[PDB]
Amino acid sequence: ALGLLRTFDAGEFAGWEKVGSFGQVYKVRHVHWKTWLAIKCSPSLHVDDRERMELLEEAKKMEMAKFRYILPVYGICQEPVGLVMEYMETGSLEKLLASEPLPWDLRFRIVHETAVGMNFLHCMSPPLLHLNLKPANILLDAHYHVKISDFGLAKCFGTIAYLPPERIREKSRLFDTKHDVYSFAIVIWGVLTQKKPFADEKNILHIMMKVVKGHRPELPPICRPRPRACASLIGLMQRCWHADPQVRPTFQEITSETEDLCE
Numbered sequence: 001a002l003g004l005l006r007t008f009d010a011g012e013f014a015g016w017e018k019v020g021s022f023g024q025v026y027k028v029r030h031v032h033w034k035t036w037l038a039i040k041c042s043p044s045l046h047v048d049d050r051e052r053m054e055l056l057e058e059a060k061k062m063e064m065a066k067f068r069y070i071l072p073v074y075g076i077c078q079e080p081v082g083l084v085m086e087y088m089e090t091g092s093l094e095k096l097l098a099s100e101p102l103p104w105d106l107r108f109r110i111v112h113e114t115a116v117g118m119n120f121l122h123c124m125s126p127p128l129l130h131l132n133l134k135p136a137n138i139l140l141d142a143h144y145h146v147k148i149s150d151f152g153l154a155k156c157f158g159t160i161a162y163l164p165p166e167r168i169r170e171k172s173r174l175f176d177t178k179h180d181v182y183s184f185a186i187v188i189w190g191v192l193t194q195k196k197p198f199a200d201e202k203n204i205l206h207i208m209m210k211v212v213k214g215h216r217p218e219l220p221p222i223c224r225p226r227p228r229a230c231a232s233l234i235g236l237m238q239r240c241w242h243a244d245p246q247v248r249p250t251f252q253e254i255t256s257e258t259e260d261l262c263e
């Protein structure tokens with residue numbers, strides 16, 4: 001896994017441009033390869049042996065999940081300590097949802113492509129859990145196709161919204177596939193609304209308390225352009241955010257339904 005990865009000297013890169021932030025992300029130009037890449041440097045000034053090894057586990061987990069809808073990783077840079085990744089021109093879904101009103105055919109495809117990627121992770125032996133899925137992680141290429149990113153919290157802030165209610169109920173609960181299914185439901189909410197969940201609210205703790213009983217983000221209305229598929233996606237979202245995690249569908253089932261929304 002970590003053998004096909006490379007080590008990058010900072011001399012190999014050029015024209016650094018900040019893009020995200022967590023740790024800052026930079027669009028760099030590999031000079032000898034004549035192509036662009038992304039690199040994520042650590043926030044700290046000193047990088048201890050936990051960081052260096054943690055970054056390596058993130059890279060290994062990315063290479064293991066080589067797939068169409070997963071972000072490719074090339075190696076780890078040493079000069080500044082950071083992860084050398086594929087550059088996605090269109091950037092994050094978060095930025096795209098803020099940017100402008102999106103057509104529904106796209107929205108449904110972004111949802112489906114994300115779902116296919118997540119399904120792939122869960123299909124591994126053993127399953128790879130993402131445990132961090134949010135529109136900031138969901139990255140889009142020049143032609144608006146998804147690649148899932150940020151395996152920093154994977155397993156073999158304003159982010160309370162993506163946290164499952166069972167995680168608030170029980171201190172130190174065992175992580176599962178149904179964690180990702182919940183977060184994915186909140187992503188769907190983001191696509192249907194182009195809003196951030198609980199954006200306007202007074203306080204975190206009140207909403208996090210109400211979530212443990214049943215209070216989820218307010219349902220969007222049925223859209224005019226694609227009212228049949230919208231209603232269907234909304235349905236799926238609701239099943240994906242159920243309080244009882246055994247009621248939530250598997251990504252095998254989810255992909256099966258999101259595919260029909262693209263037909």
Ligand SMILES: Nc1nc(N)c2nc(-c3cccc(O)c3)c(-c3cccc(O)c3)nc2n1
Nearest residue numbers: 020021038040086087088091136149150151
């Ligand atoms: N254009 C572009 N290209 C990228 N390759 C890119 N990569 C990331 C990223 C960050 C950490 C880990 C990781 O596996 C990917 C982010 C990123 C993800 C989450 C939060 C954040 O601040 C930045 N944004 C990006 N944007």
Ligand SMILES: [Cl-]
Nearest residue numbers: 226227228229
């Ligand atoms: Cl429709």
